[PDB]
């Protein structure tokens, strides 16, 4: 394929991310950024990463009867931790903060005597 022979099958119904190695050879060997992550058998030519909410990243390669293949960089950014700063939430954050400290201050006033 011009020596770009590892693909990604995305847009699944579930969040999984699957990688395909484009060759034909027994004893498929899978790399991950210059090092092994395990052997493989045949009839199952896909390597599983996980759900996209864990946003996997890295460089991967697939081996074959030929020489070293070329890597692929995967970059996922699914937020799952987004916070809105729209001048309305920060207003509610400061209000709850100032009220709590004011209330605790009245208690410490009475504690001294």
């Amino acid at each position: 394929k011009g020596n770009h022979l590892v693909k990604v099958y995305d847009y699944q119904e579930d969040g999984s991310v699957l990688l395909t190695c484009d060759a034909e050879a027994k004893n498929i060997t899978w790399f991950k950024d210059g090092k092994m992550i395990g052997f493989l058998t045949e009839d199952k030519k896909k390597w599983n990463l996980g759900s996209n909410a864990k946003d996997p990243r890295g460089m991967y390669q697939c081996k074959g009867s030929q020489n070293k293949s070329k890597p692929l960089q995967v970059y996922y950014r699914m937020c799952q931790n987004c916070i809105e700063l729209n001048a309305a939430t920060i207003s509610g954050f400061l209000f709850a903060e100032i009220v709590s400290i004011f209330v605790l201050a009245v208690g410490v006033y009475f504690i001294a005597g």
Binding site: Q80, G107, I111
Partner: protein, 36 residues
């Protein structure tokens, strides 16, 4: 696209419930010191 928001909305209820329990003990313990 997902339903993982549901557990987050369920965990928020637990944090709100614990706040009331901590409010009680702080109020309760200050009274014993004042009503010595």
């Amino acid at each position: 696209h997902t339903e993982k928001v549901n557990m987050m909305s369920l965990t928020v209820l637990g944090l709100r419930m614990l706040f009331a329990k901590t409010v009680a003990v702080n109020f309760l313990l200050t009274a014993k010191l004042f009503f010595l």
